[PDB]
């Protein structure tokens, strides 16, 4: 008796890193994701693996714009 | 169900907003050509200029260059200098290119 | 159109064998045809060429009424 299965991969620890109303510095990572679950909004960059991070010091805000997707922003302090 | 006109429109307009500038959007109809500079952060138009409002003459292309020198003229009076060109669905050429160059001679920065 | 990829259009003289001449444009200034719209069998109303047959068969034999009654 034997298994032709057995394997799985290392977990990747994805998801939101900073929640709305939290104060972040320029560079802080905000959301780690596979594809654009959330989209970069004002003051928010997106890296080659979809990682949303803050472009300026300030405060996080989320916005759910329907068929336009969900967005993350940073508002200047 | 979108159309090539509509898609092309978003396609350039989306890239313009992302650079955060004031947008010099240009409308070009069969007879006339309009242009307004908009602050998308407020959803608000800050200055306008159009052939139809200036009652201008014949040649559409020179008409464009003139509504262009116009838009700048009103513009610099409001402190507006830096701005970004919204060629909409219109290829940067002809009438639209002409308005753009008019805005440039006027001193508007882009 | 693009230049240098396109055959050039000129006033043309299509001639038929009935002696119909057609005024048109073409890549060749002069052409002769064997047949046209002005003379074709199906075309000219119902000019039923070689056969106005009506079959003729099969009642049509009739040779003759000489078999007796």
């Amino acid at each position: 008796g034997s298994t032709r299965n057995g394997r799985d991969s290392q977990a990747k620890r994805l998801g939101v890193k900073r929640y709305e109303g939290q104060v972040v510095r320029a560079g802080n990572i905000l959301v780690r994701q596979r594809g654009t679950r959330f989209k970069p909004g004002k003051n928010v960059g997106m890296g080659r693996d979809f990682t949303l991070f803050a472009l300026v010091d300030g405060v996080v805000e989320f916005q759910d714009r329907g068929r336009l997707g969900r967005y993350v922003h940073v508002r200047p302090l | 169900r979108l159309t090539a006109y509509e898609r092309r429109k978003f396609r350039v307009r989306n890239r313009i907003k992302r650079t955060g500038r004031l947008r010099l959007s240009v409308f070009r109809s069969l007879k006339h050509i309009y242009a307004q500079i908009i602050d998308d952060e407020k959803g608000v138009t800050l200055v306008s200029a159009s052939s139809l409002a200036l009652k201008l003459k014949g040649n559409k292309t020179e008409v464009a260059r003139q509504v262009g020198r116009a838009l700048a003229e009103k513009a610099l009076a409001l402190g507006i200098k830096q701005v970004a060109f919204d060629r909409g669905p219109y290829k940067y050429h002809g009438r639209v290119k002409a308005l753009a160059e008019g805005a440039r001679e006027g001193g508007l920065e882009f | 159109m693009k230049e240098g990829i396109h055959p050039k259009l000129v006033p043309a003289r299509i001639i038929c064998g009935c002696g119909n001449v057609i005024e048109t444009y073409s890549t060749k200034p002069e052409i002769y045809v064997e047949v046209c719209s002005k003379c074709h069998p199906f075309y000219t109303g119902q000019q039923r060429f070689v056969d106005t047959e009506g079959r003729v068969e099969r009642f049509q034999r009739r040779y003759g009424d000489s078999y007796r009654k």
């Binding site: - | - | 064998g17 002769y32 064997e34 060429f49 070689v50 056969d51």
Partner: protein
Amino acid sequence: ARIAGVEIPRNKRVDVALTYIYGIGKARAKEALEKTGINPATRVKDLTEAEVVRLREYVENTWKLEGELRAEVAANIKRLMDIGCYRGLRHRRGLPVRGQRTRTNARTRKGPRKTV
């Protein structure tokens, strides 16, 4: 195509060429060249566009040719096959029609031998 609906062989004498038409044989060739006064000896390449249309016009107008000829003969067998005539069954079973032995030969109607 020239006459009639087909383009008869240029480089042959005008009388032979015509027989390259479905419906016109050696007889009908000399027969068309009589009633038009065209030389039976001349090569087809050497017809006047005048001689062409005259020879053209007679032949096409007197006799059923190429397409329609095939069409009637078709309908002729079509009906014979469909009335249930003896000659019909012979066409419908694909066998010969004219009182030939079938026990041997008969190949032209039958086709290559289907050996056993």
